[PDB]
Amino acid sequence: LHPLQPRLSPRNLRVSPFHARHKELGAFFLEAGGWERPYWFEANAALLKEMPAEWLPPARDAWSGMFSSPIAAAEAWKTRTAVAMYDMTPLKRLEVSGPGALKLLQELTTADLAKKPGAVTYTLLLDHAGGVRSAITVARLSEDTFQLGANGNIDTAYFERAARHQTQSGSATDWVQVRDTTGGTCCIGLWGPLARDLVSKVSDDDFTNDGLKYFRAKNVVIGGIPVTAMRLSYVGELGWELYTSADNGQRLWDALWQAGQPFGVIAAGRAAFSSLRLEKGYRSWGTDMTTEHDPFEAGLGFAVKMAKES
Amino acid sequence: TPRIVIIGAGIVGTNLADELVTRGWNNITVLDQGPLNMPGGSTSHAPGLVFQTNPSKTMASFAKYTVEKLLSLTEDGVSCFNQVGGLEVATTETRLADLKRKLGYAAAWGIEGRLLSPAECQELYPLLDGENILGGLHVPSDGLASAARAVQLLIKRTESAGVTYRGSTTVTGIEQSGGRVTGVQTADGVIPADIVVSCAGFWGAKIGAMIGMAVPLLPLAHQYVKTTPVPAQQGRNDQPNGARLPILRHQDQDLYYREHGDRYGIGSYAHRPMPVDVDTLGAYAPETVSEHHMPSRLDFTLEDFLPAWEATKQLLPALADSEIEDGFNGIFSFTPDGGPLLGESKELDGFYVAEAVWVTHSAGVAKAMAELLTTGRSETDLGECDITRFEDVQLTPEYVSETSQQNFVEIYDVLHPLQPRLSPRNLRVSPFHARHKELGAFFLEAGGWERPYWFEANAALLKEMPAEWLPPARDAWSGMFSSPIAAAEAWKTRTAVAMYDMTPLKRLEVSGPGALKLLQELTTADLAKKPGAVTYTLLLDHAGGVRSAITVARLSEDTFQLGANGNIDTAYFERAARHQTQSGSATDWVQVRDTTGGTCCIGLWGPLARDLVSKVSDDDFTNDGLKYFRAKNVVIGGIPVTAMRLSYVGELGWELYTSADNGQRLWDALWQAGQPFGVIAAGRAAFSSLRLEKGYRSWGTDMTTEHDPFEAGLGFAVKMAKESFIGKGALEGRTEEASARRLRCLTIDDGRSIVLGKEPVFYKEQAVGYVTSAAYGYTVAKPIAYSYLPGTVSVGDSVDIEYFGRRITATVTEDPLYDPKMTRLRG
Amino acid sequence: LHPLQPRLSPRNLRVSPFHARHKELGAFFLEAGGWERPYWFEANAALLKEMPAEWLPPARDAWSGMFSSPIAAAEAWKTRTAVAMYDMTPLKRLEVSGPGALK
């Protein structure tokens, strides 16, 4: 069996709010964690006739060509030179809330999270030996509410137990609740050099550098939909992760899609996504590092604030 | 009494100070950036036309009270109301029909009115060219408010009672601590306050931003023009502002009129919407404010007015011998639904709004708010006025701008109660939305959600449907936004199995060690039962009035899911949970989440519901496996689901809840299992009809805070034996049988004449009630309507319902109309 | 019955090749000769907020308003000022061929 080989059943268990639009665009779906994830979009085949030859990869052998397509090259191309919409809905999304939330995260992570709300921080979770249990993002949305981009249900269970333990043994001001909100929310990664040109057509919020700096978050309205925008890009380009409730997702998608037409916006899938993030050197927990590695071996020293008290 | 600061000395803020004073609260400071003698908000330019009749019972009562209050507000023998009566004329058949519906509202709300023939219209208002007049509606108690004079007299008498007024004082921020208001910032310092009420008119959104509150009003300009002296009017009225003819509405041309001595005042909505940026108005130095120079008056744009002037000369040819003398583009407030914005902010304890209020409703709004502040409740239902009625997508600046401008464009149009907007649409959709479009769903929206009213795919079933299920033809009005397809969907729900989309039902998760304690105090049920129980229960106010009717499902020791009625509930629970948390122990904390947008629900109902679900689940759905009004977790088509056994349509089956990401799978699994059982998707038209056949009440129409549970026939849901709950003391002694007014089920005798809501109900030729809910009952094959009626009227008695001026005979009937032994439901 | 009143069944007997695209655009279909014919497209509702007021018609009475929509005004507007695609597939189309055709 090839490492990407999907099951044929059961399928379509979990789908993002954009699923109808993705099928319209001829998404090739693979599954992970029950979620259907586009790996590329057949609609983008039409772009290969226009793509510069410098972007066209050589033939693949039969094995590396399984569950791959030249279309991924066109999607990488447009992400690097135009603007792309990636479905980040399946990214594990945890809400950690309550008066003991900051205290919990200060102890579990390698970052100083005690900053006025709006900061996004890439940070690690270690075990007592210094091995890397996880690498996550923490966005402080308000005094007592943080949204985490985690790595899966191992993280979820880790936070659940730790929050329960803190709550049980703490005061009236140490209680903290952890919710897995992934299934109730969605996210579009809107990335590429024309990302500002696009979003400014559908929002009156300020998306310039002055309005939202790198690794910051704020609430905005796009196409009429309340969104939490976070400025970062696992693909290494300008733009934002745009989060909203599942019921609003399709509208947000359609609004952006329409705004993006003059900029040549495309839907982009996981094959391009993985290639682009590797060009950026961004680590993926579970393969690039595990608890067998410390942050310095993995080249993640920068994410560890050794000056923290604890 | 608490220290109050009121922001704004318009007709709203001064009436509020007054209503508070008469209730013994006089520790009040009123602030206005303008001079006290002419503050310069919309109140300082309003022509003051007061038409009481309104489709809304609450707005109508506010208007009646304003008329009574202004008539009694007097000095040197001259009151602040000139009661010349009001006349709405019709120049199209469509409008003529609508005046008959409005005459119904008037009877329903206790306002005396008459329909006039064209000849009678000419006798009452001789300046009308009769050639295009088809009829008029005359209300003798309407008239003209002297709004700016009323402000002065109100300032005078409240000042005498100890109220402090500070004009030329600009509020620049709001001070707070611990989630509660502490004061009001001005350049010269902070004015301390325990309560702040923003009565700032079209500045309201600007005041709101000061505490991070979204106030969904849009400032819009509206043209008002005065003519030169009109020759026909020479000598008829007192100069300079006398009036003797009824105020005049010409809604077909978006115009209204009044006299100003021998001149005419012309109000036009017959121009493009004109949004105003309040930040560009400029700061007016108080000493510069005068009649033609104030912040609320923008330059007149003659070009916009020319068509209105032509139409005016057609209606009233005498004015063709006058000219336009002075015009201005006058600013005031519009909202997404035309309702005002009243009540306590979500963001800040002790901070209240009373904004976007017509002079017509001002005193009534002030009275309601003064009741709210001093007693904790308004004596009038504020369900359509509460600031918290709006969903999140409805509070964005873009939605507020777009829908308020559309409200302005449609302000005087004849509109069906179901008429949807064409934009913005598709804001919120359930996970089943693609499947619904495949099935040709006809969508209407509410709260931002797209809701199927029926499915064109089901048209194919009408050829097979027994004739007993086919309703008679509908008239054009009751047929709008209706379809015979709803009959087939009711049919299949009653005889087969249907899948309804219950996703839009407000869904609240109340969790934490103090959750049970919170709900025990707020609701009328004993919720302390092992998890798995579902309970239908009420939320009362301290007077025993019904704030809401909800379901509470106890999912675990510290987690409850509530099926609530909208965002008024959400904000009510949010504040109550916060208050309990702040003042309680480590074991009293409780969190409230609105999870509606992250979850979905299918109502799987009908006699074949078990046959269907048992094909896609190994869980036990027999009576032994899940009893009526119980919940448990199951797996269906591979999806984890919370199943609750109950049915607002009165049939066997369950509400099936799951996370949004799983919804489409659950739907498809059920859809496929249901094929041999003839499963259909069923929409809201069938849903509403079926639930009325069951006698189930709908909060907001069938009962509001104006009713107690016994009047509404909801006594069964109140556990009077509870040790404690909000409203309990007020209900002591009350029973359904002794209630002076009781909610009754009517069926329409002719089997055919459908009514829609708000129609007056008559007993022995007296108006004694009005239609709350109504639908055609497909199972009983006749129209149904509910109305409060004097306790004196009994089952079997006859009543008349007036519909477009025609009396329709109906009979008071025992409910439920369908399956009163509940044999379809229980066991 | 209104002169435009359609049957609810049988329907969808004859459809043009554009039918899927028309449903995507929220076509309101009426039938004639067995063909499903869009009378207007709900997708075009979005254009009314942008349309000049000069193009907006007055309210219709209930009868003339049946099987009509303000959306038709926006579609007329765009046809007169931009570019529109109408489905003329149902127009009866006859091929007359052979050496005696001209005769």
Ligand SMILES: Cc1cc2nc3c(=O)[nH]c(=O)nc-3n(C[C@H](O)[C@H](O)[C@H](O)COP(=O)(O)OP(=O)(O)OC[C@@H]3O[C@@H](n4cnc5c(N)ncnc54)[C@H](O)[C@@H]3O)c2cc1C
């Ligand atoms: C052209 C026109 C015609 C109209 N015709 C009618 C009609 O015929 N019938 C009818 O019922 N209604 C009519 N209206 C509507 C009407 O006038 C308003 O609905 C009403 O006057 C609102 O009263 P208010 O007390 O809420 O607001 P306002 O009268 O606007 O007073 C509120 C204010 O608060 C003050 N304020 C605002 N911000 C601050 C601050 N930061 N610090 C201190 N003070 C502040 C302002 O200076 C002002 O006095 C008309 C309005 C216009 C523009």
Ligand SMILES: Nc1nc2c(c(=O)[nH]1)N[C@@H](CNc1ccc(C(=O)N[C@@H](CCC(=O)O)C(=O)O)cc1)CN2
């Ligand atoms: N919400 C969000 N959370 C997440 C991911 C995501 O895709 N988006 N993906 C996973 C973790 N990964 C990364 C790895 C690198 C970066 C990144 O952006 N690194 C920049 C900036 C780092 C910073 O200065 O600390 C640097 O050049 O390495 C962001 C998420 C899971 N958590």
Ligand SMILES: Nc1nc2c(c(=O)[nH]1)N[C@@H](CNc1ccc(C(=O)N[C@@H](CCC(=O)O)C(=O)O)cc1)CN2
């Ligand atoms: N989840 C759920 N919650 C809800 C509604 C719903 O549709 N489902 N709809 C709203 C409230 N309404 C009702 C009204 C009646 C019933 C009902 O079922 N009444 C039966 C049983 C009552 C019981 O014995 O107390 C009786 O015959 O009156 C259920 C919800 C909002 N809350």
Ligand SMILES: [Mg+2]
């Ligand atoms: Mg209008």
